[PDB]
């Protein structure tokens, strides 16, 4: 197995997920117009958040420790049992919070209390989201790129079918339910694929508790908590700087660039958690880690650069196809943003190493470094160049950050503190 082959499997599943999302999104737009989209905005962002929140964000830790103990049946059972207990316990608590406070949640999502029933349904749907994401994370712990990809492919296709029946039956609220069911229905193929492929015995998923492993998986919850604040906060007051001196139109130009660039990054690095994270988890010697990091960088940097150059060449086609023709001025932002994306992908290689070593301390330092650099550059370039400055700030940020990642890796590899 290799990063390239894992990328081939993961690209196929990600492309189907993108095609399914574009299909469902256009069905929702044609069916319910801007009023339906504006009312679905918060609810859809909640569905995204639940993809990590429903299982308490331990998924990367599940992958990390399954990889570490993939040849240790006793510890592996403890790992999967504790992970099952943590996902079951948290998802159950989440379901109770949702059903008990369905009225305040509906008010915060839609502006009135008319969606309590949908919120109570989501309380059960997020269990499928949490459990499905756990099974995928287990497969990734075994570096099963094919099982992961086949599961997501079946789930996307059945998700589109479920969305069609759901909105045809129940109108707008049925459509929203289908949106929540898109990431939840993966649990059906994921469970089938995991058992059928002989990855682990089914009994491993029985909830158990191990205090040590629970504390270790909690480190990945804490990284998920930190990540959901720092850079999101950064982009929020980046938009603040933008609006302070420019129009909302320019703000929309930048937000459109950022959101499509983030989706581009998620598609491009999706195989990192499938291959890179479990592989680096198993390696402990500095020579072996360096070899894998160098080999990964030698593959991903030219591949992402070639892909991003192609995207920039077709930026007008990418805008006309992927986004609503209401700006068409974001083309000038593509170059800077795409360069920053190439270096950010390179910086992800070091970032997944930190994940693979469960280093909460280096995770904090990586996040604060990215936040502060983004802030120094945004505070400099945004007031002078608007959305173009925001793209320049993002690019300059990850030029410096990737260089910093290299330097810190060299100091760590040579054991500068010892």
């Amino acid at each position, epitope marked *: 197995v290799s990063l390239a082959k894992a990328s081939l499997w993961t690209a196929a599943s990600t492309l189907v997920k993108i095609g399914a999302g574009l299909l469902v999104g256009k069905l929702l737009a044609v*069916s*319910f117009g801007p*009023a*339906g989209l504006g*009312l679905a905005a918060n609810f859809r962002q909640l569905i995204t958040v639940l993809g990590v929140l429903a299982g308490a964000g331990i998924f990367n830790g599940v992958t990390k420790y399954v990889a570490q103990y993939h040849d240790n049946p006793q510890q592996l059972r403890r790992v999967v049992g504790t992970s099952s207990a943590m996902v079951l316990g948290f998802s159950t608590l989440m379901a109770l919070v949702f059903v008990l406070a369905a*009225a305040p949640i509906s008010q915060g999502l*839609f502006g009135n*209390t*008319d*969606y*309590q*029933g*949908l919120v109570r349904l989501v309380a059960l749907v997020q269990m499928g989201i949490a459990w499905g994401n756990l099974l995928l994370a287990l497969m990734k712990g075994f570096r099963d790129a094919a099982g992961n990809a086949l599961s997501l492919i079946v789930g996307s296709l059945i998700g589109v079918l479920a969305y069609y029946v759901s*909105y*045809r*039956l*129940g*109108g*707008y*609220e*049925g459509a929203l339910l289908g949106l929540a069911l898109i990431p939840a229905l993966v649990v059906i193929p994921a469970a089938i694929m995991l058992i059928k492929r002989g990855v682990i015995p089914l009994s491993y998923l029985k909830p158990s508790w191990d205090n040590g492993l629970a504390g270790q998986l909690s480190k990945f919850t804490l990284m998920a908590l930190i990540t959901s604040v720092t850079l999101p906060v950064a982009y929020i007051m980046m938009r603040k700087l933008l609006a302070a001196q420019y129009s909302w139109d320019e703000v929309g130009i930048w937000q459109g660039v950022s959101s499509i660039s983030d989706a581009y990054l998620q598609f491009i690095t999706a195989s990192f958690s499938v291959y890179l994270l479990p592989t680096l988890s198993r390696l402990t010697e500095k020579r072996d880690i360096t070899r894998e990091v160098v080999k990964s960088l030698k593959f991903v940097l030219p591949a992402v650069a070639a892909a991003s150059f192609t995207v920039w060449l077709l930026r007008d086609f990418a805008i006309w196809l992927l986004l609503s023709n209401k700006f068409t001025a974001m083309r000038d932002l593509f170059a800077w943003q795409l360069v920053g994306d190439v270096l950010k992908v390179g910086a992800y290689v070091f970032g997944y190493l930190v994940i693979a070593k469960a280093s909460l301390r280096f995770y904090i330092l990586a996040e604060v470094s990215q936040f502060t650099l983004l802030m120094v550059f945004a505070h400099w370039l945004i007031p002078a160049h608007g959305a173009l400055g925001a793209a320049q700030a993002y690019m300059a940020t990850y030029i410096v950050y990737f260089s910093l990642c290299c330097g810190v890796f060299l100091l760590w590899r040579r054991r500068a503190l010892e």
Partner: nanobody
Amino acid sequence: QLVESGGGLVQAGGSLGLSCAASGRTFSNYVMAWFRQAPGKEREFVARISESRGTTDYADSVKGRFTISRDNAKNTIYLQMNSLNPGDTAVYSCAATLPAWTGIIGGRRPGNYPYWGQGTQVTVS
């Protein structure tokens, strides 16, 4: 987009007529509905008239007692309420939405109607 008229303090057993006017242009394509919300509960479905064949739907608590109708000439809808019992005391609101928002069986869900009126009070002594 929607304004309500009628209602108030009415003696139990007496009749009452609510009416709702709509602005805009395209009105014959909007499904029209009445909802009510009593003090302490949530918005519940009352009655609904379609945009096409003039079909009607009623909650089981108001069937036979309440009758919804519409007039596409003046873009208004009405709710006749006979045999008013104390359980009918609530704020009544008219709602408008397109048939794609209701689907096949979602016509009773208030979240499928994005356009609402201010609500008129009905108190059955």
